[PDB]
Write an enzyme that holds these catalytic residues in place. Structure first.
Site, PDB file in Angstrom:
ATOM      1  N   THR A   1       0.823  -1.203   0.000  1.00 32.77           N
ATOM      2  CA  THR A   1       0.000   0.000   0.000  1.00 32.77           C
ATOM      3  C   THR A   1       0.862   1.261   0.000  1.00 32.77           C
ATOM      4  OG1 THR A   1      -1.558  -1.253   1.374  1.00 32.77           O
ATOM      5  CG2 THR A   1      -2.009   1.076   1.041  1.00 32.77           C
ATOM      6  N   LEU A   2       0.448   2.259  -0.772  1.00 33.87           N
ATOM      7  CA  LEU A   2       1.150   3.530  -0.853  1.00 33.87           C
ATOM      8  C   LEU A   2       0.423   4.651  -0.129  1.00 33.87           C
ATOM      9  CD1 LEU A   2       2.227   3.283  -4.600  1.00 33.87           C
ATOM     10  CD2 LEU A   2       3.682   2.996  -2.594  1.00 33.87           C
TER      11      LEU A   2
ATOM     12  N   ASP B   1      -5.486  -3.026   4.404  1.00 32.33           N
ATOM     13  CA  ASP B   1      -4.453  -3.369   5.375  1.00 32.33           C
ATOM     14  C   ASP B   1      -5.059  -3.987   6.628  1.00 32.33           C
ATOM     15  OD1 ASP B   1      -2.479  -2.424   3.683  1.00 32.33           O
ATOM     16  OD2 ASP B   1      -2.478  -0.419   4.552  1.00 32.33           O
TER      17      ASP B   1
END
Lengths: 256, 239
Positions: free
Chosen positions: A1-2, A59
């Site tokens: 994940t960014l 997440d």
């Protein structure tokens, strides 16, 4: 994940005389778009441990998977109820996952709450664990659990971790936490704990754009982990000045 | 010529693994150790091998963790590799989870380490047995074998001429549960003495003794206390 894409807002967890009461609205937003309005954000790890999250939903689902299988393997090796992992154990495990991911610059975009009962002396639920059946949904009364036997942990993106009698995430770290530091007390009944949590959630509904008033309450007590029936929180404005029509004010000047 | 005992991956026509059995045979050659436990305590006692007059006795029992210790019999270097593995597993568990490891899980990991060395022709079985004594919610004694099996015991003994100690332990097994720490120590020491050679004795030099229990971290006994216990044993052996 960014970065966050689909996010939940805030969780509140407090100790009261019968265990843990944790709350989160059932909302996950796509930016300013309230795409999902019936999302579960508090998960059961075992009969004595729950996980709440704010931040990115993907997440959080990853972490929930990790803990689900960790609890399964724990049950696979169990020979006595004492062998089950405590909330402290899961908090340490999550703090470690987060620390390792920070060192790679690959964090989960979440703040996590791990809460539960840190003792086995209050019931015999872990004698015969049922993963796929719930017997609560018999006519026994809750056991008063000493505060020291209860656990509420916090983990953030950088791996910061600590425990306290009440933990908040997101905007609850400002609105709810203020009222909790002002007003929380030990050995509250379910009624008082619920009233205080509802006051915090009402303020959040009035002041946090990402929040909703559809609240999921979860309890961890001598009877195990209990999901209450989701409910709409009634939130009325606390002043008639808001509702006064603009045309009754002077037409001149910056009257708005 | 057996024709089946040359490789550690070969079954004999009777379904036996001879190399693993030889590794076990190495255990019977070691010095005797005895572990017994009451409702609150585990006592470990063992004989320290002495090479010659000018030599210091070999070490028999080792601390693994605050509430875990071991005794071994067999090839010393193997025991040292396993000792390092157990100490590291315990410390890494404290580091990661901020709690003392579950003893069953540690012993299972040790037994899996044992097992992994029996399935490839390029390995040999550990030629050593581990007697494991811990207190984790209750006293516990475990044994690990070269073949990868482990067992929990109420009283345990192995090493050269450990059958005499086993006879003593079987005789008095009923007593150990309710006896005090002093009595438990006397019992363990007498069981160990039952394995002695004709001319030998138990002395502070050649006797290793450790206790571990409810509020009693793993601790070897000092020379003064050990000497008093040995004197009591001798005197009530004269009876």
């Amino acid at each position: 994940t960014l970065g966050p894409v689909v996010t939940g807002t805030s969780v509140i967890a407090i100790k009261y005389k019968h265990g843990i009461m944790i709350a989160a609205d059932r909302k996950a937003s796509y930016g300013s778009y309230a795409k999902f309005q019936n999302v579960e954000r508090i998960f059961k790890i075992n009969n004595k441990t729950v996980m709440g999250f704010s931040g990115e939903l993907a997440d959080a689902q990853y972490l929930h998977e990790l803990l689900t299988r960790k609890n399964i393997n724990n049950l696979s090796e169990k020979k006595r109820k004492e062998d089950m992992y405590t909330p402290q154990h899961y908090h340490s495990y999550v703090s470690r996952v987060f620390y390792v991911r920070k060192n790679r610059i690959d964090p989960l975009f979440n703040n996590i709450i791990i809460a539960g009962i840190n003792s086995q002396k209050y019931d015999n639920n872990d004698d015969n664990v049922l993963l796929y059946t719930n017997k609560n949904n018999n006519n026994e009364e809750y056991k008063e659990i000493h505060k020291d036997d209860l656990y509420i942990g916090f983990v953030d993106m950088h791996g910061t971790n600590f425990c306290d009698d009440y933990i908040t995430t997101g905007y609850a770290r400002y609105f709810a936490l203020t009222l909790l530091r002002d007003h929380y007390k030990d050995n509250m009944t379910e009624e008082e704990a619920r009233i205080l949590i509802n006051e915090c959630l009402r303020i959040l509904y009035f002041r946090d754009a990402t929040s909703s008033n559809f609240i999921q309450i979860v309890k961890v007590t001598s009877k195990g982990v209990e999901y209450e029936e989701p409910y709409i929180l009634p939130c009325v404005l606390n002043s008639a000045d808001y509702v006064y029509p603009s045309t009754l004010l002077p037409p001149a000047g910056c009257m708005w | 010529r057996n024709l089946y005992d040359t490789d550690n991956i070969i079954y004999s026509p009777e379904g036996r693994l001879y190399q693993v059995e030889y590794a076990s045979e190495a255990i019977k050659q070691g010095t005797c150790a005895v572990a017994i436990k009451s409702k609150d305590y585990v006592v470990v006692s063992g004989l320290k091998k002495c090479i010659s007059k000018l030599s210091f006795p070999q070490e028999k029992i080792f601390k693994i963790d605050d509430y875990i210790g071991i005794s071994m019999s067999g090839i010393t270097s193997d025991a040292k590799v396993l000792t390092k593995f157990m100490q590291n597993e315990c410390l890494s568990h404290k580091f990661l989870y901020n709690e003392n490891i579950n003893i069953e899980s540690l012993v299972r990991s040790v037994a899996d380490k044992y097992q992994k060395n029996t399935q490839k022709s390029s390995k040999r079985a550990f030629g050593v047995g581990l007697m494991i004594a811990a207190y984790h919610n209750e006293p516990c004694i475990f044994e690990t074998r070269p073949n990868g099996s482990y067992f929990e015991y109420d009283a345990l003994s192995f090493g050269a001429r450990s059958h005499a100690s086993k006879t003593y332990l079987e005789k008095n097994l009923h007593l150990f549960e309710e006896c005090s720490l002093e009595e438990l120590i006397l019992h363990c020491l007498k069981a160990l003495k039952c394995s002695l050679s004709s001319e030998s004795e138990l002395t502070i030099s050649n006797t290793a003794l450790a206790v571990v229990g409810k509020n009693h971290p793993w601790q070897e006994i000092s020379s003064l206390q050990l000497e008093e216990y040995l004197s009591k044993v001798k005197m009530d052996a004269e009876q």
